[PDB]
């Protein structure tokens, strides 16, 4: 993570405008900071949120928000690692998991999605029930 690197990757004008959209008393909540990060095309995890919250609390100044954004960049993100995570659950090595299987994975471990969140994401990705998880991982990284 690095602030200079962040500011070459995303437009600081957007960073500022999004902060102003959500700020109260010159500070932004972690949840709204994560929303903004997502609008900027970044993907914070719960570990990122907890890092910044434990340093600065629930509401971030503009600079603290920039720091939090820098943590969200995740330049080491790698599609192969994501695919191999799903491949682990692919008991028959078919390249497919059903929507129900995917839902169970996504709602049971890690930074669990709600049932509705997982269902909606899977239906948004595919009309068909069998999900090619390689294609799914490639899609979410974009």
């Amino acid at each position: 993570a690095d602030i200079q690197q962040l500011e070459e990757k995303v437009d600081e004008s957007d960073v500022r405008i999004y902060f102003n959209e959500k700020s109260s008393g010159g500070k932004i909540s972690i949840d709204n900071a994560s929303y903004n990060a997502r609008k900027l095309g970044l993907a914070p995890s719960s570990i990122d949120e907890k890092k910044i919250k434990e340093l600065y609390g629930d509401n971030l100044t503009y600079e603290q928000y920039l720091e939090y954004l820098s943590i969200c960049v995740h330049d080491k993100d790698n599609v192969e690692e994501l695919i191999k995570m799903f491949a682990h659950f692919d008991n028959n090595c078919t390249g497919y998991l059903t929507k129900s299987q995917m839902k169970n994975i996504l709602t049971t471990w890690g930074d669990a999605l709600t049932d509705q969140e997982a269902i909606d994401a899977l239906n948004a990705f595919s009309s068909e029930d069998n999900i090619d998880y390689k294609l799914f991982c490639e899609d979410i990284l974009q």
């Binding site: 997502r38 095309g41 914070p44 191999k84 995570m85 999605l113 899609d139």
Partner: peptide, 18 residues
């Protein structure tokens, strides 16, 4: 099994949702 990678998957899903 591969928890950090699952967390990255979930993070990108939340990003896509927004």
């Amino acid at each position: 099994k591969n928890l950090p990678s699952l967390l990255r998957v979930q993070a990108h899903i939340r990003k896509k949702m927004v």
